[PDB]
Amino acid sequence: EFVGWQCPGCTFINKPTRPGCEMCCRARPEAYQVPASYQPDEEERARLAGEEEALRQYQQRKQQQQEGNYLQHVQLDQRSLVLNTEPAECPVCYSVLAPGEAVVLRECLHTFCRECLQGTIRNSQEAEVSCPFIDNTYSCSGKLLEREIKALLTPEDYQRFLDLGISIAENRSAFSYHCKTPDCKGWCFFEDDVNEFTCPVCFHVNCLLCKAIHEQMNCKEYQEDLALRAQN
Template structure:
């Protein structure tokens, strides 16, 4: 709270003007109560007009009783008082004393001159006094401004910690047209559109995409913002949120070019693999998948599994379908037989260099033969001889070396 007495004391301390020589005017009212707050006089914001008049010692001595007894209870009296001052704060009679020569004698003339000079001195310092008042006001306002900023910051932190933002005023849901009371709706963080919880829950339920878009639509545009994951979790039931997560994972799998889905029936496990990885132990069902054969053949290596498929194809329908699948891969060029052990090898992605998971032979995919000669890596006496003398092994070679 800003008390007038603080300003009066500061002016006395900084400029040496006694308390009884300071006359304060707020708006059209003289300040008569030094213990009152500025708000009492209507000073509630920066920029409000404040007038400070400094009385000279001679004027104060001769007119002290008149000033103390003067009653400014009516606006008419205040207006009459203000008319005695010019725009620069000089009394009219002081101006006349400075500009005219007295006819009553030198003594009276000197007295008038003394009073006029004192008045001019007070006016010259009036600007400095006003600046001091403004500085004092700013000094007092700084702690309150800092407290206000701290309070706002705490409110923002508390709001960010909440999973969803509740509405602070009633509104009409644009989907169901129901009147939603304070706290019963949700304000989306990204776009600030408001909906009731039931309509948002339905939007999550019927959305087929991995992300849930804001359901706001009108004749002008449709909102492209999306619900945040924590907003979905706060609005949806546990079962609905689980479905939302599975939908997101399935979408990520379908967009990945290096994904492999577990071959166990109805298993949701999948992975993203590197070119030098040949097995995928599924964390969901616990079975180990062979990425080379694209199948599960635990307790058998790739050759044993493929030989078993050939033997059972005539009698076992599943084995027959698997054999047809492998044959089609060979025909389409999506798989090759290892030139060393004849196991079917599939290229998962990347360059034309592959390695047999059975015998560890390095294979050139485009020539379907060994990459190196009999001596192994670095032997260019045989194999595809890629980049020997700067020549590729095949026009369509995709970096087998």
């Protein structure tokens, strides 16, 4: 009726807390129950201490993975474009792309050439550029961020991109009025009972009634001059 557990393989009676037999290394049978009465001696309390420290050090190892892994995810917000770390194949090109020569879209995670994305941006009829990825399951509905678009385009094309965006909103509103100066970008929104729009670009005063610029005339003088100059 001893306190310890006898080893079924070698008959050595082991201390209750030991997981393996001190003689033959056999595991403590799972049926055995350790009495709470037992106090571990200097050898067992030392072994349990080393076990709790091994667990303590393993747990702080996993926390360093957690914090180390996370900082690399935050690392990639330091730049606008995210590049491929492995070789990638462009779903539009079919071109092979060495690491650092393809762009990973932030909203989609699909990887493309800089060249095809440039045509995809310049050919987008919507102010929000979609990812051109298409497979047999789905078209990707993710959008290229303006951060990524600015870094992908020449400054000329980036400015053309912004101009198309504001003109998309302008075409959408039937309450918009554009400056009648040629090639001028100025335009405004119709306020009720306002008949003159002084454009902030050309500084010419647009008459909203005639929807034209007649600064040296009034509306009737301009209208009769207009019909007189344009006959058939």
